[PDB]
Design a protein around this ligand. Sequence first.
Ligand code: HEM
Length: 154
Amino acid sequence: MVLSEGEWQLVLHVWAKVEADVAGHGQDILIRLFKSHPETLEKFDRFKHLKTEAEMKASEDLKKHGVTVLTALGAILKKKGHHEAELKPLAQSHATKHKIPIKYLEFISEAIIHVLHSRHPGNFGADAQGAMNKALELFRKDIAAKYKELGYQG
Ligand code: HEM
């Protein structure tokens, strides 16, 4: 797939608003993910034990990780499709060390779209959501292909 420059503009316009508070958007997205699909939380030896949303909000460790994740995703989106290099180390660790199925990447995509919708309704109308969905589908397809090359394709 290939996004047009107008679609990347819609994606990087909302992302510029997310960057005003990377730690708060990280926390909202990871919590939405763990709450909606609790099986994803098991993948984290570090956070598994958290029982409620209040516990999740108070974890400084979970908030730091959410900044790591959003920074890595932000550097991929700013490449506008030319992300081959950034994707390599990400795909290798998530397919070999953490073992994350493609279906869990769909679950966090949904979580990102839910939080942008709530926090940025003015900059995330239908056309901008369609461009963000296209940018994440592109990311998942390129990661799926690398998984296969690495021997996991999950
Ligand atoms: C937006 C998609 C995602 C991005 C950009 C991302 C990014 C990262 C980054 C940068 C790290 C640190 C370095 C690394 O180990 O490679 C990380 C670690 C990790 N990721 Fe992801 N990730 C994504 C999706 C997920 C999902 C959906 C799961 C599981 C449901 C997952 C599970 C893990 C685990 C278990 C670690 C290790 C955390 C720790 O103990 O250090 N990732 N991720």
